[PDB]
Amino acid sequence: XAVLX
Amino acid sequence: XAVLX
Amino acid sequence: XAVLX
Amino acid sequence: XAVLX
Amino acid sequence: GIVKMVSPTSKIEPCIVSVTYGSMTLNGLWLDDKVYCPRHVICSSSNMNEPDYSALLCRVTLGDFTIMSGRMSLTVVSYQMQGCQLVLTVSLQNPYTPKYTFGNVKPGETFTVLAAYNGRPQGAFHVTMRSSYTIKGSFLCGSCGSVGYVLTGDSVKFVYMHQLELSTGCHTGTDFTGNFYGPYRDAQVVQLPVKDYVQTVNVIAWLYAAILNNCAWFVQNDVCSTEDFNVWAMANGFSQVKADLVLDALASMTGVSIETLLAAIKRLYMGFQGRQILGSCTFEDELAPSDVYQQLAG
Amino acid sequence: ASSGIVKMVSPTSKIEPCIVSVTYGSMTLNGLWLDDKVYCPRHVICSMNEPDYSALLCRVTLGDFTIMSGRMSLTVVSYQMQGCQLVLTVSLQNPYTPKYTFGNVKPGETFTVLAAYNGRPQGAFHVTMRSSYTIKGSFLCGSCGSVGYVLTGDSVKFVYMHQLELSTGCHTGTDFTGNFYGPYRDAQVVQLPVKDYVQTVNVIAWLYAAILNNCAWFVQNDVCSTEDFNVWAMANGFSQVKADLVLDALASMTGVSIETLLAAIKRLYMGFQGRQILGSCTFEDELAPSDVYQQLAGV
Amino acid sequence: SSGIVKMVSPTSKIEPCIVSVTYGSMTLNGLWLDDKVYCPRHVICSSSNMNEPDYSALLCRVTLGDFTIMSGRMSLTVVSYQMQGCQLVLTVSLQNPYTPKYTFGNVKPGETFTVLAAYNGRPQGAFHVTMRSSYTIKGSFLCGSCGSVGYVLTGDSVKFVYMHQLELSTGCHTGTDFTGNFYGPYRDAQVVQLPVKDYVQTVNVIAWLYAAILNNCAWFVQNDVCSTEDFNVWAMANGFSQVKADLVLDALASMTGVSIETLLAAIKRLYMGFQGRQILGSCTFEDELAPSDVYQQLAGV
Amino acid sequence: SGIVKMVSPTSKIEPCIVSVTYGSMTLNGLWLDDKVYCPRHVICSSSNMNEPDYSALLCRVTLGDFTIMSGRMSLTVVSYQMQGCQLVLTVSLQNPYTPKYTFGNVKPGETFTVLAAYNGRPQGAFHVTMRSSYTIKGSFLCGSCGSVGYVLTGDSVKFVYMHQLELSTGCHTGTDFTGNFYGPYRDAQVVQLPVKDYVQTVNVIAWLYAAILNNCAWFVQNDVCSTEDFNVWAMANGFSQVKADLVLDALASMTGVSIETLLAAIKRLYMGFQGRQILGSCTFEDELAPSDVYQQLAG
């Protein structure tokens, strides 16, 4: 997945 | 066969 | 040779 | 030993 | 010589606020009576993977918002969701609002990022928007809503609001209309970035920096038209070259035409043979023309 | 790419309002205003390639200095020369004066420079003090007086004042006691830079960033000790490895020991082959241990 | 007697492509095609290098008008230089009006081509050679021969496959292709480079047996047979290259009625000695002519 | 001382020599009034440089790609046209050093001076004779095209030649200034065999008058040959036709030795010289025209 900050 | 300069 | 700003 | 031409 | 020159942050620091809702604390930008921030501030880790946005909105009661500017505590009048940001109206107009606009950066254009955590700026760095509409930044948890910006004259052009770290290690986010650069989205799902192009006008610019810094070993007598380079560029990992007044001005400064530098690029693409250019072995494309120019001429 | 590590500069807002222009005769450069002091290079009193500064001082009188903060003219109340800087006391206390200290930077340590022209800050950039006691910056004419500093959340440590260009892209200046770094001095004559070493601990940190980023092909089963490395350093263009708690912390995080990477460095000196480390074929020594650790681990 | 020789491709299309390239006090030969000239990179040595040149550092001292390139009496202007492997590609201001249809390619061991030996830009003679398993050829090269080119014709089109650089040992030769890449593991340095072990080229010997049979010399043909799989197991151990498939051998098999496996057996017997008898007048295997060389001289092609 | 190949002075021609570039090729042009003349092949790259498509290369031509240097000055091309094998480009700036000039055309045996230039920059100059084959024996490297030949007639420059081509025989040719090639030649890198060459008879006669004038008349005897009979012969033996020539008439006056006497000497000498020399030479010399020998020996 991508990671939301 | 001739050469342009 | 060194240059002073 | 090898020679470069 | 040349460096990644970051813009000064004094106009921008006083606009940095923290925003909290429920669990999440991140960063926002305060201009006039508006605070901008990522909309995902309204998720907990629970929706956090695939969040339901339109649905999260409904349960939102104002008082749950908490917006700190230092020790001060702004009170939120109203709020709207615009793409992937929230735009919250506050009652207090920001006394240190710089003159500013909103814009949008294109591949190769560079800008400054002010990284913040918990409303408090921590440092800043210079970045280049890549072909893939991502940047190579330095971001930890709590960095979202950090802003990217360029200084144009007496004015601040806001351009990036930080949101997502991709599986490749690079970063991306939204512009200030709440819209994401490229195809990316605010969800913790697989998103492969596309391939990246070397940013050709940037390379040309660094090659002029080199010349200007008495390192022109690669300059020869071959020439390549922008037409033929472009044709080639597609096939070899280079962005298209476009007319560029700054390069024109660099060609003037140095005597070395753009076309000469296109040839050098086609050669150098075969490798450098451990010769260095400005202490480097690869193409450098993180500096825009205007960057090299500002720095070498003023 | 991308490695999570950049040249990060400390935010600039506390320093900018301390930057002033100092003018003497036909010459302007930059000064730093803190409390009721302004500091700037002494060559402002030149009109220089071999100045006799004490004689120059004699022709200095008081209202000879114009010091501007934005549009506001500061009145100087006394001047003294200290090493290669002037300290000009003014009538006015800088209301923006931050918590500060004056200090020094040892080679390998990094800081930020606020480049300014005519009192007006232009941009900031990250630099590493070299073994040559020079930095690689970006300074044109009129940049002298630009300041290098380090943050500490709230407190500013000021460490460098820009004076001198040794050679194309090679820079040096004084600390705030007015004392040049390394052996240089403010004269426009041949000053050949001390030989310059690869900063060993910075390369090590940089190797640690690379391993954390899942790039560890240079880690092998061999080890070289610090004593052994330091003997070899001298001969090969590398600085002495000293102890370092941050490297220690990364050693523990990654499970790769400092001596594992000393060996690795020795092998890497003899060539990268064609392999890259975080996309370069050369050692990267421009980031300190605590820079790598603060960007990756968060301090 | 016999009908088969070392035939070279005619040289008229290659000769006007040969130039001299001079750098410092050193001249050797180059190949000029369109507006490129190819030559060995050791042209940029001065002979207290040769032994172990650091070519990248040598490159640094190279500047542009440092090169003199002659085609006959006409001086070419070089417009760019780059090093690629162990060759320089020098771009020049002029398109060679004699440039032929051409390609660049590679020769596998056993394949043959012609070498055009040149000195000072001036061609001297041509000769047939076989790429060996050692990735060497048996040529005839003196001092100043480097940059001589080996090629194959195709009626009108020229495939260039070799640029001479190196003598490993008395009469043993190697060089680069036109990507500038040495054949086998050799490189351009005057140090001990011991040649890869060399095999009898099996298919070439087979072609030579078929020529012998066509010429009515078949005493080695017996009633036994050995298959390709069996032969290939045995080849390794005994100094012979793997037999691969080959349409020319097949065509010769059909013409003569003698099968490839008939001659594989024959080769095995012939390894343990020719016992006095000659094959087209030698007492050794002949492996210097490819299948298609034999077929072209006897059957034409 | 004496006789020499006397080259005309170059001062009136030098300030007219410009460089012309388009895309890849840099060669030479001649700037007169607000026109610069140059070979049309300036618009080819190597890629098409063997047989180039001219009418088609023209179409892609955008002005701004032209680059015309006069020293470090840089002219602006207003418009352009193709006339035979030259481009005639109009520039905005009228050339302040335009000599008084015309355009002409030399015939076999007529001589002129060539100013060889490279990259807009004159390098040397030499004296040549146009041969029967409509070729000259010059000295030309790559980059020399657009070097100009010309003659000085009075207060005026007659431009006559623009170099373009080296034949397979080692001899050279080009265009007059209407953009037309001398003889049957053409701007393509294809086989072009020059036709046979005639010895240029009035020139030989001229060199023979030079010899007499320099006390070397051993070949002058009492046989005579009419121009009518010589011509008949000349044909069959590799000599060009003799035509009436006022300078030879003037040379016959100076020396007493009629033209007819020299035609006889020529028929004899054609059988060889027997290593007797004439003006330190063993062959017929035909590179000097009557007006050359005349200018030099009388004024």
Side-chain angles (χ1 to χ4, degrees), chain E residues 1 32 37-38 45 62 92 115 121 130 132 137 142 147 153 174 193 242 256 274 291:
Chain E
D32 308 319
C37 76
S45 78
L62 299 70
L92 185 55
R130 308 234 51 112
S132 31
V147 317
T174 50
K242 269 175 189 60
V256 177
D291 303 325

Side-chain angles (χ1 to χ4, degrees), chain H residues 157-224:
Chain H
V157 184
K158 194 186 162 193
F159 291 113
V160 130
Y161 183 78
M162 187 191 281
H163 179 237
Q164 307 207 23
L165 204 58
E166 190 172 278
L167 291 331
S168 87
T169 49
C171 64
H172 302 284
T173 192
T175 37
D176 72 6
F177 278 83
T178 80
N180 207 252
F181 262 92
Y182 284 98
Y185 310 111
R186 70 197 188 80
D187 44 359
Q189 303 212 317
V190 292
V191 157
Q192 286 176 79
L193 300 141
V195 107
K196 69 187 311 272
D197 230 299
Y198 285 82
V199 178
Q200 297 299 309
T201 310
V202 295
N203 291 11
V204 169
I205 299 168
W207 168 73
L208 259 16
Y209 282 129
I212 290 156
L213 259 356
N214 270 46
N215 307 122
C216 162
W218 64 255
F219 52 90
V220 164
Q221 306 196 198
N222 276 140
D223 49 342
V224 119

Side-chain angles (χ1 to χ4, degrees), chain E residues 14-79:
Chain E
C15 304
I16 305 311
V17 291
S18 65
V19 188
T20 308
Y21 184 79
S23 68
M24 213 77 12
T25 287
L26 42 65
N27 306 282
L29 173 74
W30 185 25
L31 293 162
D32 308 319
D33 64 334
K34 305 305 198 306
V35 175
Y36 297 72
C37 76
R39 71 182 177 167
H40 68 79
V41 58
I42 71 179
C43 307
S44 59
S45 78
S46 175
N47 341 292
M48 201 184 185
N49 279 334
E50 296 91 325
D52 209 321
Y53 282 116
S54 58
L56 247 338
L57 249 191
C58 290
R59 280 196 268 178
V60 167
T61 75
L62 299 70
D64 311 303
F65 284 117
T66 294
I67 298 171
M68 302 299 285
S69 154
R71 284 104 145 22
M72 202 188 303
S73 175
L74 310 178
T75 98
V76 39
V77 167
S78 87
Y79 59 86

Side-chain angles (χ1 to χ4, degrees), chain G residues 32 34-36 73-77 92-99, chain H residues 25 46-47 49-50 138 141-143 166 168-172 189-190:
Chain G
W32 180 26
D34 301 300
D35 67 345
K36 311 309 193 161
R73 80 110 189 279
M74 177 172 68
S75 178
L76 305 188
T77 64
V92 284
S93 95
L94 174 65
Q95 172 90 170
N96 173 181
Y98 297 84
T99 312
Chain H
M25 291 284 120
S46 204
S47 177
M49 149 186 241
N50 275 161
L141 316 164
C142 306
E166 190 172 278
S168 87
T169 49
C171 64
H172 302 284
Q189 303 212 317
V190 292

Side-chain angles (χ1 to χ4, degrees), chain F residues 174-191:
Chain F
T174 47
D175 73 13
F176 288 88
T177 66
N179 186 288
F180 264 91
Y181 278 96
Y184 320 102
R185 75 184 147 91
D186 50 351
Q188 298 201 328
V189 303
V190 172
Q191 288 173 81

Side-chain angles (χ1 to χ4, degrees), chain F residues 39-261:
Chain F
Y39 306 77
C40 76
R42 86 198 162 163
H43 60 84
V44 73
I45 66 172
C46 275
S47 113
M48 159 204 209
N49 87 354
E50 192 99 44
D52 165 15
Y53 283 106
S54 23
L56 259 26
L57 236 203
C58 293
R59 332 187 159 115
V60 163
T61 114
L62 221 36
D64 282 332
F65 290 109
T66 306
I67 296 165
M68 305 301 294
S69 172
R71 84 112 185 281
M72 181 177 67
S73 182
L74 306 186
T75 66
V76 6
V77 138
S78 76
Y79 60 87
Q80 66 205 293
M81 186 168 302
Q82 171 195 29
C84 305
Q85 79 190 181
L86 288 176
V87 189
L88 304 165
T89 300
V90 284
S91 94
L92 177 62
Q93 174 82 352
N94 181 182
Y96 293 91
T97 307
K99 287 277 285 82
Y100 71 93
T101 57
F102 299 142
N104 257 247
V105 150
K106 323 309 177 229
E109 306 183 313
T110 60
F111 52 101
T112 306
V113 167
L114 215 211
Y117 299 80
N118 299 278
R120 223 165 267 116
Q122 217 222 331
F125 50 88
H126 193 276
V127 294
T128 315
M129 185 70 300
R130 307 309 314 194
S131 266
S132 49
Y133 272 112
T134 71
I135 54 158
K136 271 96 213 58
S138 189
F139 300 110
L140 298 167
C141 264
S143 68
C144 293
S146 293
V147 310
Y149 61 89
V150 196
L151 260 49
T152 285
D154 65 338
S155 176
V156 177
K157 171 162 67 104
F158 286 108
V159 297
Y160 172 96
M161 181 196 292
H162 184 59
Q163 299 227 19
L164 194 81
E165 185 201 55
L166 266 346
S167 70
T168 341
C170 179
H171 306 285
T172 193
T174 47
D175 73 13
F176 288 88
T177 66
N179 186 288
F180 264 91
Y181 278 96
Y184 320 102
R185 75 184 147 91
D186 50 351
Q188 298 201 328
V189 303
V190 172
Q191 288 173 81
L192 26 241
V194 179
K195 212 166 136 285
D196 194 9
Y197 296 74
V198 180
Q199 307 301 315
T200 291
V201 291
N202 298 4
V203 179
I204 294 184
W206 168 74
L207 267 10
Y208 280 128
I211 288 148
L212 247 10
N213 273 93
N214 190 50
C215 168
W217 63 260
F218 45 78
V219 184
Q220 290 190 173
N221 43 92
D222 57 353
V223 161
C224 168
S225 89
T226 60
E227 315 60 38
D228 273 5
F229 185 83
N230 285 162
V231 161
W232 178 92
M234 262 303 262
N236 298 86
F238 281 89
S239 57
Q240 303 297 93
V241 156
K242 294 266 202 70
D244 195 322
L245 303 146
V246 182
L247 300 177
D248 290 357
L250 306 156
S252 175
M253 285 158 69
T254 64
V256 183
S257 85
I258 284 156
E259 36 293 86
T260 305
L261 296 160

